[PDB]
Amino acid sequence: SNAMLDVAIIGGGPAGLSAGLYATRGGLKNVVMFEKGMPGGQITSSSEIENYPGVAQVMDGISFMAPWSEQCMRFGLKHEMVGVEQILKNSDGSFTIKLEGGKTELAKAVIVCTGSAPKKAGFKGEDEFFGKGVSTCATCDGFFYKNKEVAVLGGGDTALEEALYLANICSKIYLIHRRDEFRAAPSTVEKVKKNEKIELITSASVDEVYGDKMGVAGVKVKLKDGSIRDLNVPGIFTFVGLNVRNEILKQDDSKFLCNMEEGGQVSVDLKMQTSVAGLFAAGDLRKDAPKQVICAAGDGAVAALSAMAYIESL
Amino acid sequence: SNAMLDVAIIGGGPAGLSAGLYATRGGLKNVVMFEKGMPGGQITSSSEIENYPGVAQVMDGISFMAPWSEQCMRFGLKHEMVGVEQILKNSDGSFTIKLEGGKTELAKAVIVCTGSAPKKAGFKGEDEFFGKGVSTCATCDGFFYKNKEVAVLGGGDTALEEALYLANICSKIYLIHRRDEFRAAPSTVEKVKKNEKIELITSASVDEVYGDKMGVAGVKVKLKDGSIRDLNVPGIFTFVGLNVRNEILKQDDSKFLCNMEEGGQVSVDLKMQTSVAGLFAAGDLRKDAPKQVICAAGDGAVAALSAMAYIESL
Numbered sequence A, B: 001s002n003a004m005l006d007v008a009i010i011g012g013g014p015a016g017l018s019a020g021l022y023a024t025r026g027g028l029k030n031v032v033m034f035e036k037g038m039p040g041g042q043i044t045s046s047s048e049i050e051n052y053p054g055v056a057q058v059m060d061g062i063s064f065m066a067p068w069s070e071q072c073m074r075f076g077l078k079h080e081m082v083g084v085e086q087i088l089k090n091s092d093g094s095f096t097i098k099l100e101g102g103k104t105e106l107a108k109a110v111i112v113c114t115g116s117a118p119k120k121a122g123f124k125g126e127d128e129f130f131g132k133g134v135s136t137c138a139t140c141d142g143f144f145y146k147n148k149e150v151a152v153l154g155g156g157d158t159a160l161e162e163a164l165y166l167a168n169i170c171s172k173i174y175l176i177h178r179r180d181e182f183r184a185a186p187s188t189v190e191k192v193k194k195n196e197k198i199e200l201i202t203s204a205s206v207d208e209v210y211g212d213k214m215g216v217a218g219v220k221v222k223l224k225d226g227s228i229r230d231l232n233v234p235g236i237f238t239f240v241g242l243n244v245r246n247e248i249l250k251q252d253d254s255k256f257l258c259n260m261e262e263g264g265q266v267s268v269d270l271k272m273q274t275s276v277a278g279l280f281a282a283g284d285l286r287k288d289a290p291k292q293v294i295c296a297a298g299d300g301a302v303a304a305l306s307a308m309a310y311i312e313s314l
């Protein structure tokens, strides 16, 4: 803060944490990871991760991520709990980091790690009921729906997993998806087809969620034949994908700071180098991201290794 | 073996194991990981890994890798304990995998994961004494040098780490490196400068290791001023880097199966796609590899995700 940072890391999920670990273990002394909440990012809202190689114990996202803070902070990494609004490239080659509330930081290098956020499904009442029966986090809100029926929308690994989790809590789940077959791991699909508490509604979509100020009262589902089915349920959870959070790269002339991809990803090469010297990107934000925890970690380590070499070069 | 494989994975280190985990969890049913020894690969010979994010317990390479086999084999991954000699691309788009002893396998897709092997340092007697006092594995051979003096050659994280490990076993270590400063994590360097049992010989190199059929008897070191120092020691361990194992991509006309990099790496894009359809590469073998365990795991998951999409496409 008094002196210019070596690296500013924007986001504290697996990619940020991992970049912070590598940059500081590696020898850089002023490394701040700006994460608006607590670190962990997206996965902390999952009920089950099991595919992170080298971690053989199946557990929830919060338990999975808990040890990371201590580990990734052993060599001096700092966590500032603030939101970042904008990255700028200075005429001199340094970076300016704009923070919420009008504060500013300077940095030789920047690794943008800001992750992704839940896509809109696109149905009537989605926005109007968000936080009053419409949700994108089952671990946060499950408890409110104990011994109650809810809907879950989506057909990927995430939807099914959170449907299994909600099946231990709610009396019943309607799992709704627009295709006849799920795009998801077969062992998860088998557990879902075998769970007496989950009813599949396939080749279907959500027409409307309705209710009033007190909350959601129900969901209208459009079935394969074009008919409507009225689900009398106080909650629906949506898991239809996520968009990249790339707001902070947008300049005041509405252009992006570096080369972007068609779908909003930041363009990078294998070393996570963007088109702008000293700006790196890792995790879901980078080009062609597979959207996995192990991969966001790999990327973060690459970025830090490239941010170190770049710093040694000047 | 009776039917064509979905994926053949060549190598079982972190990258292979991780690719096998992803490909099988993902739904592919015939996936063989060909690993000539036991899985784990290079890191199993390290005395300490601590920087694999999400694993907060510091431990040796064998303990680190032990849980992986069970985890990465939960969805049907097969381990064939055989060496692979050659990859071929069939006129029809399938792959032929040539094994040691004249056996053959077929596969829709191939992920080459074969890792790297210890570079030669380039000194007189290096080859002549290999396995009779010259070594590249301190955990394998340390025990033979209990209460004895040895030399360690190299100046990276690996050399220093194995020098710390050998310092609990041997009476003394001479750490030799060609530069005045080590290219390594500062916390490791500090532990090395603080260890009463390790003597640094900087700006130096090895002129000759000598001895006879009974083994190494000593090392001649060339010092910064051009003079020779005779280290009377029965062992020297070298850690001067590694080369990629890319032998199996070489065809009979001596050309490589796909586009290669100047330093022997296999050219890939972000999705670990090589120039040849259905051939992927991950870990140290791929272009610009950072040479880290977390990264080889990330890559392996990417490759498997790309091998799945490719397979669904045909």
Ligand SMILES: Cc1cc2nc3c(=O)[nH]c(=O)nc-3n(C[C@H](O)[C@H](O)[C@H](O)COP(=O)(O)OP(=O)(O)OC[C@H]3O[C@@H](n4cnc5c(N)ncnc54)[C@H](O)[C@@H]3O)c2cc1C
Pocket: A010, A011, A012, A013, A014, A015, A016, A034, A035, A036, A037, A038, A039, A040, A041, A042, A043, A045, A046, A047, A048, A049, A050, A051, A082, A083, A084, A085, A113, A114, A115, A116, A158, A245, A248, A282, A283, A284, A285, A291, A292, A293, A294, A296
């Ligand atoms: C429900 C669910 C289940 C999943 N299950 C699995 C699984 O089983 N296996 C698997 O591999 N993957 C799974 N994933 C994917 C995995 O969670 C993501 O790939 C991964 O976390 C992406 O990591 P990241 O570090 O790139 O970004 P993120 O996880 O999003 O980390 C980004 C962090 O940056 C912070 N941030 C963003 N913008 C700013 C800013 N402006 N200022 C300050 N802070 C900011 C955010 O608050 C967030 O905490 C799952 C994802 C979800 C949603």
Ligand SMILES: Cc1cc2nc3c(=O)[nH]c(=O)nc-3n(C[C@H](O)[C@H](O)[C@H](O)COP(=O)(O)OP(=O)(O)OC[C@H]3O[C@@H](n4cnc5c(N)ncnc54)[C@H](O)[C@@H]3O)c2cc1C
Pocket: B010, B011, B012, B013, B014, B015, B016, B034, B035, B036, B037, B038, B039, B040, B041, B042, B043, B045, B046, B047, B048, B049, B050, B051, B082, B083, B084, B085, B113, B114, B115, B116, B158, B245, B248, B282, B283, B284, B285, B291, B292, B293, B294, B296
């Ligand atoms: C001493 C040492 C210490 C290290 N310490 C760290 C550390 O602290 N942190 C870190 O991140 N990284 C460390 N590394 C680096 C890390 O070990 C490598 O980056 C990583 O293991 C590369 O993984 P890979 O899966 O690409 O290849 P590998 O680890 O080499 O795995 C390849 C496997 O493929 C098998 N194989 C190869 N060719 C064939 C074939 N023809 N047929 C059948 N099988 C074959 C081999 O037997 C080998 O087991 C260290 C490396 C060494 C040598």
